[PDB]
Design a binder for this molecule. Structure first.
Ligand SMILES: O=C(O)c1cccc(N2CCC(O)CC2)c1C(=O)O
Ligand SMILES: [Zn+2]
Ligand SMILES: [Zn+2]
Length: 217
């Protein structure tokens, strides 16, 4: 397995990339973010595992940053894998109410703090959370960074294929993807979980793939 990767994407914004072999998928890359505010750091999705979450946190703490919190974009373990270890270290963990419920049903440890509704501020005017409706999973949310115009789409952004449909709502995904295109068309950078960073076009491509996936069912 390739090592945890951490790259500067923009000023105060980093992409972390972790890797896990998944049956019927091979080695799966997973992108998340670290967002820097003053001398504080926010995890946008945890890596797959506690070890890599520890590795990631250590890298930033070692640079003089405090980890103020982590937000998980959906319940799957490529977003939540690290919640246990963070909780154990009293670092505040965030996820939607839906996400927390699905983690519970799945017999997984939940995030300490939750939220619900359409729009949520994790940090006022710096880190916004938006729930477009079901798609890749019932609970998938996106994270918007206003200053830099960066959107983390998580596993909802699927420009070339929908990927793992095990917990997908193919019926709702096109509608959800339309609402996401309307609101965030002004994004400079769009960060998918499982493919590379693109511009606002990735929103359109996601919509087409959702529509195409529905037609096929
Ligand atoms: O979103 C995907 O397309 C995807 C691809 C490969 C592995 C995945 N998961 C990794 C985490 C594991 O808990 C379930 C599958 C996913 C996903 O559904 O997020
Ligand atoms: Zn997923
Ligand atoms: Zn995923």
């Amino acid at each position: 397995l390739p090592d945890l990767k951490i790259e500067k994407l923009d000023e105060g914004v980093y992409v972390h990339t972790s890797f896990e072999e998944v049956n019927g998928w091979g080695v799966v890359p997973k992108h998340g973010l670290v967002v820097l505010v003053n001398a504080e750091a926010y995890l946008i999705d945890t890596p797959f595992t506690a070890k890599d979450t520890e590795k990631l946190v250590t890298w930033f703490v070692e640079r003089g940053y405090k980890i103020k919190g982590s937000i998980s974009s959906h319940f799957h373990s490529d977003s939540t894998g690290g919640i246990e270890w963070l909780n154990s270290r009293s670092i505040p963990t965030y996820a939607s109410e839906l996400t927390n419920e699905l983690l519970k049903k799945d017999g997984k440890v939940q995030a300490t703090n939750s939220f619900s509704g359409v729009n949520y501020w994790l940090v006022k005017n710096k880190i916004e959370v938006f729930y477009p409706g079901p798609g890749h999973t019932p609970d998938n949310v996106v994270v918007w960074l206003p200053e830099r115009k960066i959107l983390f789409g998580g596993c909802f952004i699927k420009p070339y294929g929908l990927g793992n449909l095990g917990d997908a709502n193919i019926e709702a995904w096109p509608k959800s993807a339309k609402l996401l295109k309307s609101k965030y068309g002004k994004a400079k950078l769009v960060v998918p979980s499982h493919s590379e960073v693109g511009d606002a076009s990735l929103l359109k491509l996601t919509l087409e793939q959702a529509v195409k996936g529905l037609n096929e069912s």
